[PDB]
Amino acid sequence: MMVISEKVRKALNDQLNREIYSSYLYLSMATYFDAEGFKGFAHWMKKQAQEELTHAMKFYEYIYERGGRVELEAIEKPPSNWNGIKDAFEAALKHEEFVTQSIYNILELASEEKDHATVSFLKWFVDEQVEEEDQVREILDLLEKANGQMSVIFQLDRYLGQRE
């Protein structure tokens, strides 16, 4: 039998589908950077999309570990265009903050039910949001000092294009 409540399973399953969309969004940011000829920024976004998928699969495996089942839902069309490099990264940061708030909501739901297993499972994602939000803020800080200077954009494109 399933040892998560149906309310926590649905929250976990909802977050899994949220992570699939996040991975899709970053791929669509990659389509934008490649359309604009920034292969380094695009590469960074392709790697970010891959990383979101591994988040989704950790939700996947935890649900089955607790006797639940995953049901995949429709994935909405992401935006495909942004008003330049900095605009895209601002949309990225606002998106990560939304992901953080949705993780917090599952954590508060689980602790209200005394589902300590799920509370503990979610700590990893809380810690990762701190790092992912920070990565985007640091990039935005550089774009704000760059003030559109192409000599600095180029070096930043090549640097992010080196992401492993």
Ligand X SMILES: CCCCCCCCCCCCCCCCCCCC
Q: Please enumerate, by residue number, every residue annotated as part of a binding site for Fe cation.
A: 19, 52, 55, 96, 129
Residue 50 as a binder of ligand X (CB under 6 A): the answer is yes
Q: What is the amino acid identity at position 159?
A: Y
Residue 24 as a binder of ligand X (CB under 6 A): the answer is yes
Give the separation between CA 13 and CA 79, rounded to whole angstroms: 23
Note whether 55 and 99 are within 8 A (CB): no
Q: Which of residues 31-70 bind a second copy (CB under 8 A)?
A: 31, 34-35, 37, 39, 46, 57, 60, 64-67, 69-70
Calculate the alpha carbon distances from 5 to 12, 24, 127 in Å: 10, 29, 25
Please choose, out of 10-18, 20-28, 82-90, 140-148, the segment that lies near ligand X by the rule CB under 6 A. 20-28
Residue 53 as a binder of ligand X (CB under 6 A): the answer is yes
Report the residue number, 7 or 108, with the smaller CB distance to a second copy: 108
Q: Which two tokens stand for residue 136?
A: 């985007």
